[PDB]
Design a protein around this ligand. Structure first.
Ligand SMILES: Cn1cc(-c2ccc3nnc(Sc4ccc5ncccc5c4)n3n2)cn1
Ligand SMILES: [Cl-]
Length: 294
């Protein structure tokens, strides 16, 4: 019930955030049709020529300090612009501090549900291509010294050109329960995350891709994944995963974080493997993974 007067905000901060601000007449949020839902708010179809967008309605912000941090995050996120990264269209703030985050609309939704869909017919080439795109997005994000911490197929999205966008970061961060099965050994133990721990998660994402969205370690008690790994174990090679790509996954899971490939090396290696395929190998679903909850 707290009142907030927005006119109390820093003049320099309101000036610097202008290029990220969307006018009240520039945006039409269709509160009728919900397209997504997270812990921090619902996502609605929006109209921003008229372009489709995704509008996330955050919880009403009541402290002007927290408003300032929301604006600062907007400016930084705005500059995380890359073909393979979900790229912020702008931010909106209504009377009494009702924030709207405006993102490009992703026609094909999240990458995990896309690959799981039985009506889709991916080839090895298609799936490796998606993996390659994710590596390019992460290469960019690492160059901005940004550590994602929650890289997973569920957190990447696909547009109408089948361009993959690394998403779920900055103002778009949400659960749409740490993601322990995507976490590097050292992160499970020290709770610290780096670009090299993102490379571990990326290897798990490649495994998700080649299994068409199987839950990793299907029969492993989440509360014991460190013990399981320390027995001397990794995810098995998916049936339709090429040997060199499985070799890349094993590199992503190197026990020594500094020995893992950079995203730059991953883009290079995966571009080469991708180039060898012509789209003749269809990837089918493993009977033992069908209906297994994650
Ligand atoms: C299962 N699932 C995962 C997501 C998701 C993932 C990352 C992520 N990073 N930002 C957002 S919000 C968003 C962004 C674009 C959309 N485009 C179409 C439909 C829903 C959309 C939702 N997301 N949403 C939504 N459902
Ligand atoms: Cl192929």
């Amino acid at each position: 019930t707290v009142h907030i007067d927005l006119s109390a905000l820093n003049p320099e901060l309101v000036q610097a955030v202008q290029h990220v601000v969307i006018g009240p007449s520039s945006l039409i949020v269709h509160f009728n049709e919900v397209i997504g839902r997270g812990h921090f708010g619902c996502v609605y179809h929006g109209t921003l020529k008229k372009i489709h967008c995704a509008v996330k309605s955050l919880n009403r912000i009541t402290d002007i300090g927290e408003v300032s941090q929301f604006l600062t995050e907007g400016i930084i996120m705005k500059d995380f612009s890359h073909p393979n990264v979900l790229s912020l269209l702008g931010i909106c703030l209504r009377s009494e501090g009702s924030p709207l985050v405006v993102l490009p609309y992703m026609k094909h939704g999240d990458l995990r549900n896309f690959i799981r869909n039985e009506t889709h017919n991916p080839t090895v080439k298609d799936l490796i291509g998606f993996g390659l795109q994710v590596a390019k997005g992460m290469k960019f994000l690492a160059s901005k010294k940004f550590v994602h911490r929650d890289l997973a197929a569920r957190n990447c999205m696909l547009d109408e050109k089948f361009t993959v966008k690394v998403a779920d970061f900055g103002l778009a961060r949400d659960m749409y329960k740490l993601p322990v099965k995507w976490m590097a050994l050292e992160s499970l133990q020290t709770q610290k995350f780096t670009t090299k721990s993102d490379v571990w998660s990326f290897g798990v994402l490649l495994w998700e891709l080649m299994t068409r969205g199987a839950p990793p370690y299907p029969d492993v008690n989440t509360f014991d994944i460190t013990v399981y790994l320390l027995q001397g174990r990794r995810l098995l090679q998916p049936e339709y995963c090429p040997d060199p790509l499985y070799e890349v996954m094993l590199k992503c899971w190197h026990p020594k974080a500094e020995m893992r490939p950079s995203f730059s090396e991953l883009v290079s290696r995966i571009s080469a493997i991708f180039s060898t395929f012509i789209g003749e190998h269809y990837v089918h679903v493993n009977a033992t993974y069908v209906n297994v909850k994650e």
